[PDB]
Structure formats: structure tokens, C-alpha cells
Design a protein around this ligand. Structure first.
Ligand SMILES: CC(C)[C@H]1NC(=O)[C@H](NC(=N)N)CCCCNC(=O)[C@H](CCCCN)NC(=O)[C@H](CCCCN)NC(=O)Cc2cccc(c2)CNC1=O
Lengths: 38, 154
């Protein structure tokens, strides 16, 4: 069985770590919901 | 019980539990990615949540009512992933999204890498609105990950 349990409130955090780049990628989405790089 | 917030999705298997994903309770509806639950029912305390709407191609499912999350990325502001990884405390990570370019238009995308059971973690705008869920993505050449900001149609 699958069950849910609360993990927190949903809020923006002001002192947040910032990281990750901003890639621009050509992708396709197929009927199964898979994205693939083109 | 349906109190607004972010939730882990767990499966009780063999002995202990395993976190298979994450979802958002809002306006009495639970929102998660299809690949987390495979569209099957959920327990919430003593109460059963039944699937209401879903789409394998979008990789989304809502429980108890239609998809309620309607806010969208503005296409240029930084966002926060409220990552809820297995075995770890919920935490906020800010990032400037990249873009999935598709034949049908552009999708915001975040280059942040977490375990599979983090799927369904909400991505937020600066008003704290959920602009989509994390976890349907691609693996680029160096092995790192980029997730679409996946949002339903309200
Ligand atoms: C951190 C730890 C290192 C963990 N990291 C990850 O697992 C992903 N990070 C990554 N750097 N690999 C983020 C997973 C985020 C949650 N999201 C999914 O789990 C969906 C579930 C499926 C949704 C399908 N509609 N998976 C996808 O989006 C994509 C893209 C699917 C591409 C389809 N052409 N699949 C994968 O990454 C599978 C994979 C590949 C190599 C190697 C691995 C895992 C081994 N790594 C891991 O165990």
C-alpha cells in the first residue's frame, strides 16, 4: 500500500541557496510521457 | 485528512517504508506525478484518496478532484524547488530555469539533481505559488539532470 505523510508547508525561502545552470535543450515528448533529447 | 502542504508518498513494502515520491495538497486535492503512483489509490491516515484526473503524457495525476495548480512560470524569474528527498528534510533550492524547446513551444526546466523519490516536489514562484512539479526530465551528456517544470491545466 501507498500512503502519504505531511512533509512541510509550501513557502518561498528568502535566504535560499542558488545553483544550477539554465540549459536550453531541444527535446521531444512522446505519448508515454518520456522526454528525449533530439 | 487533506491539510494543505507538501507530502511524501510512501510504500510500505516487506519491512519498512520507501519514499517513492512527493506531492502537493491544495484546495482538498492531492497533486503528484503519474510515475510516482502509477495512478493507484493512496491512503491518508485512515482515509482513502481516489484518483480523479490524470494523463500519462503530462505525467500528472490528481486525487479527490480536478487539478487545482494553475500558476505558471513567468519565463524570466528565478524559481525555488522545494525538494523533499527520501530520508532528508524538505529544503528550498533557488535556480534560474533553462528551457525545453519542443515542437509545440517552450517549457521551463530546472537543472537540479535529486533521487528518484524526490519526484513530485513542487517548484515555486516568489509568491509561493506552485508553478509545477519536479521530476520528468532528461539526462544530458555529462550525466547531470534537467527536469521540466511540469504543470497541469487547471
Ligand atoms: C541522485 C541520483 C544520482 C539519482 N538521480 C536520478 O535518478 C535523476 N538524475 C540523473 N542525474 N540521472 C533524477 C531523477 C529525478 C526524479 N525523476 C525520475 O526519476 C524520472 C522517472 C521517469 C519519468 C519518465 N516519464 N526520471 C527522469 O526524468 C530521467 C530522464 C528519463 C529520460 C527518458 N528519455 N531518468 C533518469 O534520470 C534515470 C537515470 C539515468 C541514469 C542514471 C541514474 C538514473 C542514477 N541516478 C539516480 O539514481
Amino acid at each position: 500500500d501507498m500512503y502519504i505523510e505531511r512533509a512541510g508547508d509550501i513557502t518561498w525561502e528568502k535566504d535560499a541557496e542558488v545553483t544550477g545552470n539554465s540549459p536550453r535543450l531541444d527535446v521531444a515528448l512522446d505519448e508515454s510521457g518520456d522526454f528525449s533529447l533530439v | 485528512e487533506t491539510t494543505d502542504g507538501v507530502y511524501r508518498v510512501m510504500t510500505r513494502r516487506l519491512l519498512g517504508s520507501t519514499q517513492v515520491g512527493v506531492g502537493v495538497m491544495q484546495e482538498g486535492v492531492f497533486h503528484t506525478m503519474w510515475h510516482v503512483t502509477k495512478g493507484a489509490a493512496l491512503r491518508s491516515g485512515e482515509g482513502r484518496l481516489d484518483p480523479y484526473w490524470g494523463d500519462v503524457k503530462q505525467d500528472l495525476v490528481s486525487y479527490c478532484g480536478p487539478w487545482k495548480l494553475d500558476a505558471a512560470w513567468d519565463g524570466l524569474s528565478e524559481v525555488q524547488l522545494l525538494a523533499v528527498p527520501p530520508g532528508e528534510r524538505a529544503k528550498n533550492i533557488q535556480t534560474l530555469p533553462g528551457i525545453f524547446k519542443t515542437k509545440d513551444g517552450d517549457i521551463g526546466a530546472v537543472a537540479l539533481d535529486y533521487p528518484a523519490g524526490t519526484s513530485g516536489s513542487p517548484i515555486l514562484d516568489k509568491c509561493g505559488r506552485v508553478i509545477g512539479l519536479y521530476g520528468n526530465g532528461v539526462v544530458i551528456k555529462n550525466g547531470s539532470y534537467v527536469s521540466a517544470i511540469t504543470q497541469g491545466k487547471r
